[PDB]
Amino acid sequence: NNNIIKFDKARFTVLTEHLIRIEYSETGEFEERMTQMVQNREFSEVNFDIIEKEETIEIITSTVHLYYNGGEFTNASLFADVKFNFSVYSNRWYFGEKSDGNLKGTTRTLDMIDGECPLEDGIMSKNGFAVLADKGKVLTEVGDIAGNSVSTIDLYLFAYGRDYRQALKDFYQLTGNTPKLPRFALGNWWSRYYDYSDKSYLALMDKFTDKKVPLSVSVIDMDWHKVSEVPSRFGSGWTGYSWNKKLFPNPENFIDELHQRKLKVTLNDHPADGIRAFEDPYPQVAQTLDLNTELEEAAKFDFDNLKFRKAYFEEVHGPLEKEGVDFWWIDWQQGAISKSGVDPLWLLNHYQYQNAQKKHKNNIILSRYAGPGSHRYPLGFSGDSVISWASLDFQPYFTSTASNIGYTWWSHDIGGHMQGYKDAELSLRWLQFGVFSPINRLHSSKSEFTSKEPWHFDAVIEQSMIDFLQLRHQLIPYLYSANLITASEGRALVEPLYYEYPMEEEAYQHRNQYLFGEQLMVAPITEKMNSLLQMGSVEVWFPEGTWYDFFSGQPYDGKVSLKVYREITEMPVFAKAGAIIPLDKNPLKKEEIPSEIIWKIFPGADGEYLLLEEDNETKAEFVNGIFTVTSKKESSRKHTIIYGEHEIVSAKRGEFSIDLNGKEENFDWNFSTALFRRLDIAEISYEQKDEILQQLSLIEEHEKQVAFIKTNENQELQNSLFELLYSGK
Amino acid sequence: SLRWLQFGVFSPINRLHSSKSEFTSKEPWHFDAVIEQSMIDFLQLRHQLIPYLYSANLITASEGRALVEPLYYEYPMEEEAYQHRNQYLFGEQLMVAPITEKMNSLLQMGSVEVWFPEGTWYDFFSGQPYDGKVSLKVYREITEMPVFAKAGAIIPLDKNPLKKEEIPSEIIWKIFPGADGEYLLLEEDNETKAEFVNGIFTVTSKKESSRKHTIIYGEHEIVSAKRGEFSIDLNGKEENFDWNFSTALFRRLDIAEISYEQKDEILQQLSLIEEHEKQVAFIKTNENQELQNSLFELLYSGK
Amino acid sequence: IRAFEDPYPQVAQTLDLNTELEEAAKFDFDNLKFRKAYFEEVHGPLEKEGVDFWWIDWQQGAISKSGVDPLWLLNHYQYQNAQKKHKNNIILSRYAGPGSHRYPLGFSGDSVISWASLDFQPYFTSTASNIGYTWWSHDIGGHMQGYKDAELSLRWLQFGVFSPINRLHSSKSEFTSKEPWHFDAVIEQSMIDFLQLRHQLIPYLYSANLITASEGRALVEPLYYEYPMEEEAYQHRNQYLFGEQLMVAPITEKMNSLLQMGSVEVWFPEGTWYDFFSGQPYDGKVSLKVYREITEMPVFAKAG
């Protein structure tokens, strides 16, 4: 290509104006094969300039000067200046050195993490550049490990400035797009490390139905297989591939019952102790792998070994798949050691994801993060988080930041995995976040005390959990459409604020705040409520424009940073004037695609929404007060229209256009009602409640209502009252 | 000592006195150069106020009106007039809210919650404006005292407080713009009426004298040392005081014993953010609660 | 020297740069031609306009192709170049390792404005004599960030007056000027008094300077240079000899508001000592806490 330049023992490939591959080869041969990370180096031709001398080369694009002075790559011989002024003297990359500015990415797991842990770098930087080292093995054409690259140094310099979305799109072009998820992945999952029987698991699935909680996925954790029944001469029962016949006497019939309830079924797989001589598949595996059965030779876990992988997929998983297991939960915690030097977690996710496509279209796994490019193998499984306010407070930041290395389908144990402390409000706050996260999978530890069942809790917590779990299914149309946008356009469902607002300092100062698809902005509450107010709070940054609480219609004039207060049953989620959000009208109804969609419109601006589905595209447009719905293909689907407060049209078939210029724009939300409710629940003096209600009702001028609350001795009560006055301004 | 002298100057009688200690002299030069200058300034102000005090004295003797009134004399039906115990009317034209608490060292300012009755009020010293009716915490450096006058207030001042003379040879008429007003200066041997009506300021007296009148309209000295009766039209003249948000903001941030990064962010954000409601939202997020109240006072006066 | 700069056309001609691709003359103090163009064609024109000496403010790391720290290359070559235009000329730059005392003055840089920073700085300054680096210039009052406290500013200036170099400097803040009249009348007068004292001390300082150059004696010595066998000479970290006739114990802690005085524990060696300012006498040998108003500094001289 004209986009390739060789100099001394180095090779430079200008992939985009903002992305340069940098290689070193001792042997004069450079690597064309794919790697664990890189799937594609075919990019459209771009313009750049070169200054090539006897001893030095300079490559010049719109955004970077890359310099190479010959010899081995050192911090002195290989370095780059960006053509940006985001910093005073952090604008230079030096080979092998770290600079300030990296917005971070993700890490393997939250196992044993109570609150924060360190993250790896991503490709996004406030200073406009990042280097992504390719240290992986080469692949063959069909995707097996081929050994060591002949490019013994192979780097990708990203110099996208603060065009983070383009950086991520081009990262997906280099490393491969995220595959499409199946719609079932986006519903509620039930999971618990608990020794259910077939009977008690079905009873619980039937109780969810009776309780009006919709589920898409039934997880069965490790007590599906033998555990205490494993003789100790074999080691533990952590790894298992044999049903516990007491609990599951007829596994296929049990899985058939979950399938009749329209559930997908996954089993926990702890692979590290392989297939030992007590296991039901051991005689077949022993025959295939020529094991010494009289010395009970184990088929040890070895995902570098083609014959082992084949026996694992065909003879260990295969029989369980025939019984109706839909996909695999790979729960790998036993380290990064293999003879090849490839992390066994990477070998599991890569080969198991590929194997899962044989039985079902667009199938998934559930496994931990295996490094850059491992987004090709959804879903992410963060693991054994400690049950704490601190863990919840980290998790939104964790989730949105992961988009910076393209890993956009994290599934967290909703409510936390293990250890930690009981607090029903923590459980409820965690579920609110989970509903507005990539995947909503309830899971817990082996404790008798950690079930995430809503009815574990009091009547208030129970009803709120059921409400949010129903909301998750209402959101599946929006989630599935965003999923197809991830797969086709390389846009994350969960974005940090700085993707949309890269030049706004406040977009970097609200770590737990994020965009959720294109129409919603979420600010989860991740701190225990103030008992004096009976409300939790978070500081929300409202960008320029008019924003509405998604639930209440409470309005906010951006741009402003404002502390917002919500009761434990309520979550801060916001939509702009002109937002159009589809919702399943029948979230409890078992059906492949919604028979009815609610179009929820926020007045005050034009807008539009494209609902992508398996077999259709439906465009909702709101222009000069006219709402129009059209689709590629016709269907019997019935559309409901909600304009602000009011249901305008109920269950109307086919394409149509309705004029909403006539209709009531304003939500009911009003200062006086909200004021009365905040004062009423507060655990403060009745004399203070009486004085605040009286004075805020009597005082007419907005500035004097604010002066009145400014004298209040309760500082947090001032901030709560200020939120209502700001919304009522 | 300095706060006490500020109160004393706006009290019925200003008598410095102390115990038999070697350490309790009320001499201004007992103290450091800052305290000394402020004490001298307030002690000079007391003599500037003698014309106003002597006139109120004759009103006590003849009409049975106190020089110092609780707020509830003027505002008997306002609950807030019973909730500001140290706040008072001082004659008919001034409202005083002495600071009687040690300064907050983080702000380098003391404070008191002031109730502003209905109407437009001005700091007597600075011209900082306040829209009543409101209860508002006000902050002052140790050298400054909260004293307020309504639009239309007319306060006479001795122009020569150090000059030993039985009656002032020169009076300053200090006028607060925005309303009509009047003031009757009662003296041993004279009555002098100052009237401010539809922007016309008039001075007349029972008896003639060689007294020279100076007129200060808001900020500006309009007429210097003019003899006898007269009338001058101030509709032409600049109504507004110099007091401005930006200057006062810079001064409060500059003296505060807070982080320079906080000072820089507040100055930048309050200068950039245009909408009053969003300037108030910005200060509402400040972690320093008393700094919020100080910044709120300036934003309220600048509204 | 990048393509927008006033000297770039001359530097581009000297270094054979590609001006139509706006090739920068990148910083490269290993390169003889770069150094020559930097001194003659970049600094030279500014020197002709009357610039007397160079403040090298290098913060961009220790990387060069040679393995020599670019800060060392700057101090070594710029000090040598500064002698061409003026006799006994200086630079102002950070410490570049042992031997870099040959290139005065030291420039310590971007200290945080705090009592903690001031409390470190006397110990920092006297201890530097132990590697022969005896001309540290600190940003007097602190450089950046930190907190406002007029008394910290005044204490810092008192130290600076009794330090190798008294250079007032500050951050880009609207709130960090070291002008004395930034402060109240008490702080202002005391700062003016100490700034006048610095000029009163120039004869003593210049004489000590010639003693550094000719006899290898530091202006600022730790107590243990004079009193190596006295345990207390190792236990008063901020106390130092200042030339041969003065012993300084700066106050580097906020005053006790009950006393309206700051304090420091002073070790008085054997002999009769006098406060330099007041004449208050002290009989050594003794360790004694001394108290001073914010406007006063503990500085002592022996009988004789």
TrEMBL record, chain C:
Gene Ontology biological process terms in this record: carbohydrate metabolic process
Keyword Hydrolase in record: yes
Keyword hit for Ligase: no
Organism annotation: Lactococcus lactis subsp. cremoris (strain MG1363)
MF terms (GO), sorted A to Z: hydrolase activity, hydrolyzing O-glycosyl compounds
Swiss-Prot/TrEMBL keywords: Glycosidase, Hydrolase
Protein family: Belongs to the glycosyl hydrolase 31 family.
Protein name: Alpha-xylosidase
Domain Glycosyl hydrolase family 31 C-terminal span(s) in chain numbering: 217-304
Domain spans labelled Glycoside hydrolase family 31 TIM barrel: 1-208
